[PDB]
Structure formats: structure tokens, C-alpha cells
């Protein structure tokens, strides 16, 4: 009668969450539905040489390329590759870290077969590195807080302040500072940058905002793998805090 | 300090090696798709003189803006905003706390993004408490089953993993293959991508807007994710 109580709390949290997300997104979806219907009607009015069926075929052809991983915006020939050494390193890192953006996913049958075996053997391999970093860093943090405890209201209270301090430092070095960097590089708003860092470091990875390629502009080949190194050190910093607490 | 660094090197090598394999598997398809879409855009402008090349890009961007928000720009829908209703927002809420994040439907408003940060920060550890609670109660049942076998150990452990791959991996994939209309590989690919909380979003259960789904189907899939995530957690911990 303890796990069932937790299950009820979780179901209630999903129903409550569903009610809040519905009220926040229903007016925007209705406005976007009305907007796109008007933009299609006005395009045909402004371009008399385009038939209504020819417009739909163009849209579906652009969506066919977009779903495959190729953005139909701008000159595709001039655009960089989503599967070059740098981008495929970030795709590999995206699989083993269970973030799964889903923006540049495998389309070929061979790519799907290798992706199953890559996640099955790569996710536990990454977990061994993530735990190894967290246990080595938890030892350093354990030694630093034991030195603070030796100097000193409550022995439990002095450990909570240290925990808050570790979270605050991590939220500046791995959350605040990187979000400022993404805001300038990608051209996202301040809200979108924090939203991206939270969605990424929590391994949710929606894919609505992706560190690299979120524009038809040419991104450097060294920028995208460096973002994975931020993901590695960010995921690992919070793992050492939870290992120290436990 | 010469053990974690060795693991780090193995992981980096695994990413470089993985990147080389994925590049060889997907580079010919990406090149073909890039050539295809560039030709379709050039032919549209050749057939429609009255359309400027910039006016074409603006139309594409506008269609993609609606598509990413959840509204398909193909044809016309209605007040059927079934992407953010009580049923779909319940699955989106599940998509967040389980860290799967399909991202087929995501928050667009600023308020929706603010609530999503606080929903994941307080919901992911809440789901983790249920996932650990199920796994510890499940591990006790496993322990009692393996102690009964020992009274009559690696083979038994392998048998308990093979049972999970049939009940939670093989059987569900067969059901999705017929219902959704996916190929045998796509079904296994979906189950692996889902149970490993990767959630790309390329294949979503109950996502094909053209299928008249029965009411008992979509909530049954989320029950499978819940009971499968605990059994799959024991496999990844053993590995």
C-alpha cells in the first residue's frame, strides 16, 4: 500500500498537468490553425498562376524532406551535412545519453538496425562513465564538506546549506552561462535558452530547439561536438550531487 | 584516477566509431533527399513564373511553422484541436516525467515553456520514485523465483531477461506492427527507442492521425511503457 499510493499521486499529477498544458496551448493552437488556413488562401490570391492542388503538393514535398532530416528552407546544396563526422558524433552522443532529439534520426533500414544495437550496448556504457564520474566527484565533495563540518547550529543543517551551494554553482556554470552562449549563437530568446538547457540536461530532448542546425546558417564543425562535452560535464555534475546525498 | 579516464576514452572511441558507421548508413539517403528537394523547389519556380524564389521560401517556412506547432498545413482541419485536448495533454505530461520526450507536440507559448520547466524539475523525480518502487517490489518477486530454482544462477538470470524481451519487447512490437501498419523492423525500433527513453518521435504510438483508434488502445500503450520501464531498468542495471 505504498507504491500504489505513489502511482495515484503520479496519475493525479498527469491529469493536473494535462489540464494546465491544455489551458496554456489550446488558444495558440486555435490561432495557428486559423493563421495557416489564411496564409494558404492569401498565397493563392497573390499568385494566380498556382493552383490550390499544386500548393498542397509543394507543402507535402517540403514536409517529406523535413521529416527525413533535410530542411526545405534555403539552398540545401550550400547547407552543411547532418551526418558528417561532427554531427554523427553528436547523434551518437544523443543516443547513449537517452536525450533523443529526433530531428536527425535514421531513415535507412541499416541505420535503424545499427541504432537498436547502438542504444542497447551504448546506453549502459554511458551509464558506467556517468556513474564513475559522479562517484569520483562525490568523494571530492564528501572530503570538502567533511572539512567544513570539522570546523563547525545543527550537524544536519550545515550539510543542507552545502547541498544548496552545490546546486547554485551548478546552475550558474552548467545552466546560466551555457544558456547565455546559446542565446547569442542560435538566436533564441532568453526563455527558449533556459527551456533548451532544462530539456537537454534532464534527458527529455523534445527536439523543438536543437543546439546545432537550428537555422539555415553554416555552423562550425567543432561547435556541435563541444555542446556534447557540456552535456557530459553537466549530466555528470548533478550525478555527483545525488550520489553524495545518497 | 586512471580508471574513470580509461572509461571516458572507451566512450569517446565508441562515439567516433558510432559516428563513422551512422555516416556510411545515412550519407547516401541524405544526399539523395537534398538533391530531390532542391529539384522540386527549382521546378516549382520554373512552372510558376508569378512566384519569386523568396516568396517560395516564406511559404515553406510558414507551413513548417504550423507543422511544428502541431497543425498540419496539408488541407484543412477544424475546431478538432486533438493535439492539446485532455487525452493528448495527459500523454504529453507522461512524455515529460518519463524523459521520453517524443517532441511531435511540444509547448509553443512562453507560459507553456515556463510550466514545462517546473513540470519536468518536479515531475521527473516523482516518476523516478514510482519507477524505483515498482522495480524494488519486482526485484523481490525475481529474488523469490530465483531462490526457488536454486533450492531445486546465471542461466536463470538470462531466462528472466529473455522473458522480459518477449512480454515487453516481442509481443508489444507484434501488436504495433498490425495496428499502426509499421514494418517488423520499425516495430522493434519503436519499442527499443521508447523503453530506452530516447524517444526520437519519428514513430509514435497512436500518432497516425488517419487511423480511427479504439478507446482502449492509447491508455493501454502508456500502461505498457510504465510496466516495461521497470523491467527494462533491471536489464540495463545487470548490463
Amino acid at each position, epitope marked *: 500500500k505504498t507504491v500504489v499510493a505513489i502511482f495515484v499521486v503520479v496519475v493525479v499529477y498527469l491529469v493536473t498537468g494535462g489540464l494546465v498544458f491544455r489551458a496554456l496551448e489550446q488558444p495558440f493552437e486555435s490561432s495557428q490553425k486559423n493563421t495557416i488556413a489564411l496564409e494558404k488562401a492569401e498565397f493563392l490570391r497573390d499568385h494566380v498562376c498556382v493552383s490550390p492542388q499544386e500548393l498542397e503538393t509543394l507543402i507535402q514535398h517540403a514536409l517529406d524532406a523535413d521529416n527525413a532530416g533535410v530542411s526545405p528552407i534555403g539552398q540545401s546544396s550550400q547547407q552543411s551535412s547532418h551526418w558528417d563526422l561532427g554531427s554523427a558524433f553528436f547523434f551518437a552522443g544523443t543516443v547513449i545519453t537517452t536525450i533523443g532529439y529526433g530531428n536527425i534520426a535514421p531513415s535507412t533500414e541499416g541505420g535503424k538496425i545499427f541504432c537498436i544495437l547502438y542504444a542497447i550496448f551504448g546506453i549502459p556504457l554511458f551509464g558506467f562513465l556517468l556513474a564513475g564520474i559522479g562517484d569520483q566527484l562525490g568523494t571530492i565533495f564528501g572530503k570538502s564538506i567533511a572539512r567544513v563540518e570539522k570546523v563547525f547550529v545543527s550537524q544536519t543543517k550545515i550539510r543542507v546549506i552545502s547541498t544548496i551551494l552545490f546546486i547554485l554553482a551548478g546552475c550558474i556554470v552548467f545552466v546560466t552561462i551555457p544558456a547565455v552562449i546559446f542565446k547569442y549563437i542560435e*538566436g533564441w530568446t532568453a526563455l527558449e535558452s533556459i527551456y533548451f538547457v532544462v530539456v537537454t540536461l534532464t534527458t527529455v530532448g523534445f527536439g523543438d530547439f536543437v543546439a546545432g542546425g537550428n537555422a539555415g546558417i553554416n555552423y562550425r564543425e567543432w561547435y556541435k561536438p563541444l555542446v556534447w562535452f557540456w552535456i557530459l560535464v553537466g549530466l555528470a555534475y548533478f550525478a555527483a550531487v545525488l550520489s553524495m546525498i545518497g | 584516477m586512471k580508471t574513470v579516464v580509461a572509461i571516458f576514452v572507451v566512450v569517446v572511441v565508441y562515439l567516433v566509431t558510432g559516428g563513422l558507421v551512422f555516416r556510411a548508413l545515412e550519407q547516401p539517403f541524405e544526399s539523395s533527399q537534398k538533391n530531390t528537394i532542391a529539384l522540386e523547389k527549382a521546378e516549382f519556380l520554373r512552372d510558376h513564373v508569378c512566384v519569386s524564389p523568396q516568396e517560395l521560401e516564406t511559404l515553406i517556412q510558414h507551413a513548417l511553422d504550423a507543422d511544428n506547432a502541431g497543425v498540419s498545413p496539408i488541407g484543412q482541419s477544424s475546431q478538432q484541436s486533438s493535439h492539446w485536448d485532455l487525452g493528448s495533454a495527459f500523454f504529453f505530461a507522461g512524455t515529460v516525467i518519463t524523459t521520453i520526450g517524443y517532441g511531435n507536440i511540444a509547448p509553443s507559448t512562453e507560459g507553456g515553456k515556463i510550466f514545462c520547466i517546473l513540470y519536468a524539475i518536479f515531475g521527473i523525480p516523482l516518476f523516478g520514485f514510482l519507477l524505483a518502487g515498482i522495480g524494488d517490489q519486482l526485484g523481490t518477486i525475481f529474488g523469490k523465483s530465483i531462490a526457488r530454482v536454486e533450492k531445486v544462477r546465471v542461466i536463470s538470470t538470462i531466462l528472466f531477461i529473455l522473458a522480459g524481451c518477449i512480454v515487453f519487447v516481442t509481443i508489444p512490437a507484434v501488436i504495433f506492427k498490425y495496428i499502426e501498419g509499421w514494418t517488423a523492423l520499425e516495430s522493434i525500433y519503436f519499442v527499443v527507442v521508447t523503453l530506452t527513453t530516447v524517444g526520437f518521435g519519428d514513430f509514435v504510438a497512436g500518432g497516425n492521425a488517419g487511423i480511427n483508434y479504439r478507446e482502449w488502445y492509447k491508455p493501454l500503450v502508456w500502461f505498457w511503457i510504465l510496466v516495461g520501464l521497470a523491467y527494462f531498468a533491471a536489464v540495463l542495471s545487470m548490463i
Partner: nanobody
Amino acid sequence: VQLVESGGGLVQAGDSLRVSCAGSGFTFTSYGMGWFRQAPGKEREFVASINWNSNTAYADSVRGRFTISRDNAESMMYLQMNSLKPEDTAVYYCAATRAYSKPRVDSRHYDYWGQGTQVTV
């Protein structure tokens, strides 16, 4: 650092007029700019917006009539206003955002602003 508007005139109802906004002292291609307006006795209202390339976004009151555009080679932005109504007579200010990914619509996100140009219908 500086935004300059030009094209404010007096026009008849149901007629077309185009106003221009030129950027100076900053990298034009890295800033997503847009238009805003303010009629006498009313608060500031959104008009049009564009990203670094060709993604536009308009207010529900001016879609299908107004057209925002940019020519990065000439470091300029244009707003072609068609079939101008007597409800469009306002001071039009052009503003720019360091966040270029999508066409921003909230005035809070726009950093640099213009002096305004009076279009009277």
C-alpha cells in the same frame, strides 16, 4: 546602434504605400527586426516581423494587406502596406532583436528601436 525610418506620408483609404527602415552600426544579418505602431490615444501595437532570412509574421489585423521584407545586401527592411484603412494612421517604429531564429512578436524581446514615421490615412 541606430535605426532610421523613411516613408511617412498622407494617403487615401484603400491605397498602397511602402515604408523603409535602415540599420547602421551593427551586423544587419545577425538581427531579426520588425515593425510596430501607435495611434493617438492607443497603446503600442504589433505590426510585422521577420527573422534573419525570409520567415515573416504579422498581426491578425494586418495579415493579407501588409508585407514585411528585407534585403540583407542593401542593409534594409521594407513594409509594403496595401489597402490602407483609416484605422492604420499611426507612428510606425522599426525595432530589432539579437535573437534572429524566429520572427519575434513581443515588444519585450526587441532591443534597439527607431524614432517612428507618421503614416496618415
